[PDB]
């Protein structure tokens, strides 16, 4: 049963999903459930069901598959040839679950502030909620030498629905009381090149992606607004006018604009799509050109294993190498979630005034 | 030449194509604040004004083989707070530059440009309130590779469709990236050249075409794509089998068993 | 190399361009540059490149032409058979350049008024800027017996861009200070049949077009608001409420509506497209039916020189005579720039109160 390679746009799709941790993987051990890691046997690439042993299309989403279809498999695609994608996908999956636990944590606390405490901060300012960063996803590959990316994915039912719900609830509260969070950024790119660091946070080394070439285990980074409180001319009134998120992002419930967090986990800021865009989706702030590199090893692997015409007729002009190049030039468009280029142009307060340090996430007035 | 047969035209809306599907399109990335006004003359020396900015798309002429383009802005609006398409002019501009289109941001990178054709638009009121409807157009351009005479291998050939005007077009008035949100009809100007997914090939391997196109890819292929041709040759076989075969659902026949044989061994 | 006649819509296009002075003409002497008059060898008619010796299509805008293509030319189209178009085009060209110099002149002056002078007029009214009409394009075919239409076209780079820019600047100023110009009309048709004339202006004879059958040399006509100033009940307050352009046309920066001038040159008012239409284009106030007559002689010329079927198949039903007739009935639509039918319906002040006379253009309060 002869099989063909997938088309360019289907590999672009694989990559886009990987960086949302939603690639549909099938292993003979665990089936279509990727909660427990196992070597991929098949992966869904833009509708097509691809064999991870030859990278041939052996099915589609239309007909259900319980096993890897019997096919004439060249068997020359090695695990090492596509693990970069598998890594990207699994790590993002671990990352989203980690980010969720963090959001819930802030939510619950914020949703417990006594009406008195709230009102006091509304009037004079000062701390309202503080989370010990040591408690932010303590046993993830991002916070412990013992954990690995191959570890089981924390089973979370309705991950995306909760992420949407909680992030919304949290931000609506932060907005109605003109509060100030120390875990948000107007432009996440400032995290890698802009904000000034203090404490241990100074040695931070941003890979700016999710790959197995730079430790992803690190601390929870947030803003140190301490010196702001101290400042006389920057009291409550000041905060209400420039610091509260609404001033730079717009009022949460009335904006399309995305909001980003500071590097809370995996030295990777999170971007949340605006509320009026439909729902609040979360995406890691990784460049498209970076995402594409996860298939760099696969290109050579395919070129070595498949026939010239087969590669040309499936991947298009320039074969798969050509596809890779043409895609690299389009990365900003074809490999970039819309939310990443949806930040408010106008920014009063900004991200460059106070320093970022490994510390406790918190909401204050 | 041997594989090809008389081709048929194809329709596209360059604006709604996916650039990761139609390998013959290039685009200036949005969100970069890219925006620059330029000036180009037509073959009669007349100077024209138009803007290139984030979102602007062009057709990569190189490698598509002889091809005729006809653009129909009929039905579209393009009406903005400070821009009325009625009486305005649109044109086809052909660029010749060594710099890749995606990288453009300043007028200095466009190399050699010529407005090759233009028409004046007529707008009225459409069934949709507050919207203006542009009259049917037939802006044409024939891409003849031999006329361009590409020499320098680093030369890129681009095709654009935007508003052109005798007066500088104020960027905040007319904000559209181009007028590619229209009906484009491509017609091969040769039946001896064949392409595969956007680019010319000197020869085809029919059997490797089998099962290698996604619906997206087929739809985005050029009118002279080998697949399209394979399909028209194959349909004569389908027609033949039907003249002889009166088999009902699930009934075998002399024309179905050949597959059964392959399946049996497979 | 057999050639065919152009299609109806292409001749309509030629005419429309002629009355904007933008017909692309080619002469063996000057090439595609028409700065210096010469007999036309080719003209561009709606995309097609037509031979002016047989009126056959010998090319298009797609392929560049350096000479008149070698073709089987019947050579029966005489210069006299299409000069009416050439005349129209060249005269409009001369007209636009003349109108531009006038606009610039008002602009510069208005853009020099000392803040004191301005403010005084803002408060009490009275003259603010005055141009000696003898200085308005003194050496044009419109102001001197010595000049001719065949004279060289004043080389002006970016004519249309300047016309747009200056007209805008000038009107924005006139609008912000509620000023009053004496060179504008709410409905240019009133110039030919409405406004009452005084002085020598009474003998004015409007051809209502640009043709070689009525002198186009005349004075600069404007409104004589003199008796308005004198009137007690029509002081500054009155002007701010009814006379300033904004009251009848709308606020310049917020309107689609066109603004017209009084007969400044060639006894032909100029119409400027509204600012919110995209740009400010200038067009002479000539009826479509008038424009069409420029090809009346060409029709007979073609009917005499071409074969019956050739004319029928190119010009359509009724041949070229039929085309001419059908077009005459459509003139209001197919030969009328949109700006000419875009004036405010509501007009408080109007054009009929004060008289028009050959005088100095001016802006006052
Ligand atoms: Zn396989
Ligand atoms: Zn001729």
Curated annotation (Swiss-Prot), chain B:
Post-translational modification comment from the UniProt entry: Cleaved during the endosomal proteolytic disassembly of the outer capsid. Mu-1 is proteolytically cleaved into mu-1N and mu-1C during the maturation step to generate the ISVP. Cleavage of mu-1 to mu-1C is dependent on myristoylation and binding to sigma-3 protein. Mu-1C is further cleaved into delta (59 kDa), and phi (13 kDa) segments during entry into the host cell cytoplasm. Mu-1 and mu-1N are N-terminally myristoylated. This acylation is essential for the membrane fusion activity.
Glycosylation sites: 149, 173, 219
Cleavable signal peptide: none
Biological function: Major outer capsid protein involved in host cell membrane penetration. In the endocytic compartment, outer-capsid protein sigma-3 is removed by cathepsin proteases, which exposes the viral membrane-penetration protein mu-1. Both myristoylated peptides mu-1N and phi are released during infectious subvirion particles (ISVP) formation in the endosome. They associate with host membranes and mu-1N induces permeabilization and delivery of transcriptionally active viral particles into the host cell cytoplasm. Seems to induce apoptosis in the host cell.
Family to which this protein belongs: Belongs to the orthoreovirus mu-1 protein family.
Domains (record comment): The C-terminal region, phi, determines both targeting to intracellular membranes and induction of apoptosis.
SUBUNIT field: Heterohexamer of three sigma-3 and three Mu-1 proteins.
Name this protein carries in UniProt: Outer capsid protein mu-1
Species the sequence originates in: Reovirus type 1 (strain Lang)
Gene that this sequence comes from: M2
Part of the full-length chain shown: 310 to 575 of 708
